[PDB]
Amino acid sequence: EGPKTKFHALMQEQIHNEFTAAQQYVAIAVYFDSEDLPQLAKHFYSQAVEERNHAMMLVQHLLDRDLRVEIPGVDTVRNQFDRPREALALALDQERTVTDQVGRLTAVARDEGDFLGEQFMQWFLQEQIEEVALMATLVRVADRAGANLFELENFVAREVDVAPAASGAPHAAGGRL
Amino acid sequence: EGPKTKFHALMQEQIHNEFTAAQQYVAIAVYFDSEDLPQLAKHFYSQAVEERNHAMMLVQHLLDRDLRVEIPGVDTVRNQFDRPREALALALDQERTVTDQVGRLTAVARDEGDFLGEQFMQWFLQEQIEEVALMATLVRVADRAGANLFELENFVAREVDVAPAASGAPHAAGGRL
Amino acid sequence: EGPKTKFHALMQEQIHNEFTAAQQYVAIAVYFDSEDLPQLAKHFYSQAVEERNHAMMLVQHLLDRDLRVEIPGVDTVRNQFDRPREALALALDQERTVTDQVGRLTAVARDEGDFLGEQFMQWFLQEQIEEVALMATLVRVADRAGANLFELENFVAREVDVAPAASGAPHAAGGRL
Amino acid sequence: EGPKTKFHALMQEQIHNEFTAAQQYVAIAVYFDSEDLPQLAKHFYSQAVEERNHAMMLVQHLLDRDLRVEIPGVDTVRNQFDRPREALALALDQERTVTDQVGRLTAVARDEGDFLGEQFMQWFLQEQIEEVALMATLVRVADRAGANLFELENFVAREVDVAPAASGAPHAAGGRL
Amino acid sequence: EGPKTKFHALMQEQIHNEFTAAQQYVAIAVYFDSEDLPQLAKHFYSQAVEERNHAMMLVQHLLDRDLRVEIPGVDTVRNQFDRPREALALALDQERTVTDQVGRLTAVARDEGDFLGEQFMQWFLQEQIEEVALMATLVRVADRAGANLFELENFVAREVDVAPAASGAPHAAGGRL
Amino acid sequence: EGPKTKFHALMQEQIHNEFTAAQQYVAIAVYFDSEDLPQLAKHFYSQAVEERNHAMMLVQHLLDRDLRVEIPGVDTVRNQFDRPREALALALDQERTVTDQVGRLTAVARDEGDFLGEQFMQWFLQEQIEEVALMATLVRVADRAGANLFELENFVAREVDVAPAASGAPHAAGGRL
């Protein structure tokens, strides 16, 4: 209790960050749900679930290496939004922050010579590319729609496709939801 | 912002309590997972998911009545346990506390004359009976097994059965996981 | 317009290189086609298509990161060959050059601290191993066949197998052909 | 090397033109892709592929007549557009230019008394009618939609139908993609 | 014969190490077989086969890069064990040593600027995480079982699951067994 | 430890010999693989696997009689060959040597009055007939082909048939691969 490597410490923080991110995505979906944007709400419920899966993957990685892992609390998240665009903006900012965090985790792994950690990080880097692309798309399409939220909903219904999970995902503690 | 009924306030607290309970169940499952009790860990991963569903149901109820609902933070939960029995004890104590909370919610609904709330509460009362029974079973079987954790795992594998959800559950925001 | 990172610049050059490589593969296939080596021609038509897919993947990567991407021209390629071996040699030299280019792209990604780029590059490294192996095989088998082109064609028909794409390929702009 | 008929020369130029046209269609699709007009982008990715097929057909025709054929470079194409309409306009202008080119090829065939060439040209004339009609439709529908790009996308999704290739197409070198 | 890179040399040593590891796993399985622990013996026969596959993958990698590869001898392995736990301990120590070896191979690849080698190593890093986790589980469960070997066998039968190979494995010389 | 019968001792040596033979077959297959003789390489990968099975059968026989059995090391094998014929010659010489070894094992069994051993040996005698016949065929066909290795490969592809294992094989420790 005390000889924790930087990578171990950073991974525990990332588990906190991921659970917090999942909760923020839930808050955003509920906000959309209560503005009668079901398509957006459905998409973000899915996102909350997948963020939860990511946290479980970090947990599972710590279990597999027999490193001490704790399930954290969750910070309060944001529920007030003036307009749907502001919540899509928050989600884009969150995805970009997650990209930075995973990059920092990779860098710390490489610095400590923790090869296992570095390899494990690679899949998250890959997921981040696609996630950020989709959130940026949603933000741009929201700007184009402006006041007309129905067009935004129609774009989401036609163009935003739930993909069944590719293989290659790391195993999540408790199985991937 | 301010004319919130007691039932509305209490339901928002219950949403906080349920999310916290789900997180505590996750912590317990991870603890079991890292003690190599896969059967117990699998059961409690399921329990965490179902507690999450319950919180979503409370959320959905507030959405359906157009009452203000906020997704809360989550308190830190307990991760240290000296022995598996102590974690099964924590889970039993939590289920009993939840029974009290749902009973208090029912009582507050009845007091305010909120019939909709009272009816909605009924399903949770029903779920509590079965949940508490199962946790109490697990605690008694852990005592009987004592030091021999393999028997506990074998009991769980043979006797503890995931049931597909009966009908009659209230709808959960974002669909039941 | 001007703050382009080295990785962005290098990726745009690689898009030019890949389209050029696809066109050179087409030229080689047409050359084989007109020497009545259908098996070789069929193989290299496939190769041209797969190089095109690779270019589309680089394009898609730039789209996903919202980086400016331009579809380039294509340099003139080589059409004259004295003998089929000389064209298989050109193809081997091209595959090796591509290996260098992808390695340089990886190195530039690592240097700029562009983790997303580095991860994305990994799949191309992997494809290069197999591609170079197969081209080197074709060159050695051409030497062994010498003047007797029928044996070369028979080797290709029996031993060179189109594999359906494994999973794990990055997504190509416009879908993988 | 030097006794090339006008039809042979013109066909080699047309192969250059077709490859250039395919690349321009790719540039247009990528432009649409990066403006979040997936339906338009999908349509033009298809168009790029079909232009490539056309070039391959011209190649195959030269192979079948044992006429010298070279795979050319590709001119740089246009990537900047101020607004989607301007790119649909470019595509319409390109289809009309292609109609002129194929007509000139037919006329040159008839002039040299190259019956084989003339017959072969007929299928391209036929394809041009339909292609120009569709591009002109897209331009008119873009004008009607004006600023509202969502309507344009909806028109494309409902009304623009990929048809499986009719029979009667000439064979393409390397098989029709 | 003499300009061998460090990565080439280290890979040849790793091929020796992997074949030796496979043979040691066979010795362990035979030891379990002759102590009437069929479930453990079955698991370790599988492990021996999969270690053999790993060696074949390293071989295939050297074949694909046209690097000189030799099939080595195999060192004598350990057959005497005082108690099954001591053999599970040997297997855990071996898996950890393999993790170090693959990490050293990765580091040497990165040092020489051998990108192909580094990418190829990644899959082995990933396999090591899971393998070490499972061996550590077996050791802990053996300690918990103590003198009672039947519980150990029962844990293995219920909880240790042969997974069909995921995709993404590198190709093994002679096909994966 | 010391009252080992001649048959027991000889069987342990044979286990060493068989593992060595399997490794030599692997070396030969890899040699063929790296000369681009896939059909020969495939055949000898199969042979290596079947030699491994034979060693496992000898192991299993010692397990069934509760005789002490040790998994041995493996001698270094030959990897250099000047020409494919020289490796087919090595394989023929090895199969003939194995025939002698199994005959000596039978003779020693008969001498010690070990009926169980003698009966068990019979299946190996039978396998040797067919194996030697096939290797001798390959050598003669290689001589007939001479410099023209393609004919050798074609003979192997058409005439050398993997047969599913007949019944009557003795059981192999860890199941027959």
Residue numbers in the entry:
A (entry chain W), B (entry chain D), C (entry chain H), D (entry chain G), E (entry chain M), F (entry chain A): 5 to 181
Which passages does the manuscript contain on this structure?
Ferritins are protein complexes that are involved in iron homeostasis and DNA repair by storing iron in cage-like structures. This protein complex is formed by 12 or 24 subunits with tetrahedral 23-symmetric or octahedral 432-symmetric arrangements, depending on the subfamily to which it belongs. Here, a straightforward expression and purification protocol is presented that provides an apoferritin, bacterioferritin B (BfrB), from Mycobacterium tuberculosis with high yield and purity. Similar to as in S. coelicolor bacterioferritin, Fe2+ enters BfrB from the B-pore and is converted to Fe3+ at the ferroxidase centres.
A 2.12 Å resolution cryo-EM structure of BfrB is reported, showing the typical cage-like oligomer constituting of 24 monomers related by 432 symmetry. However, it also contains a unique C-terminal extension (164–181), which loops into the cage region of the shell and provides extra stability to the protein. Part of this region was ambiguous in previous crystal structures but could be built within the cryo-EM map. The C-terminal region 164–181 consists of a flexible part (Cflex, 164–173) and a rigid part (Crigid, 174–181), as described by Khare et al.. We found the extension of the C-terminal end to be located within the interior of the BfrB cage, which is remarkable as Mt-enc has been reported to encapsulate BfrB via this C-terminal extension. Our EM map displays well defined density for Crigid, residues 174–181, including a double conformation of residue His175. We placed water molecules here, as we lack experimental evidence for these water molecules being ions. Both the A and the B site have clear densities, where the A site is coordinated by Glu22 (2.55 Å), Glu55 (2.78 and 2.82 Å), His58 (2.51 Å) and neighbouring water molecules (2.44 and 2.65 Å).
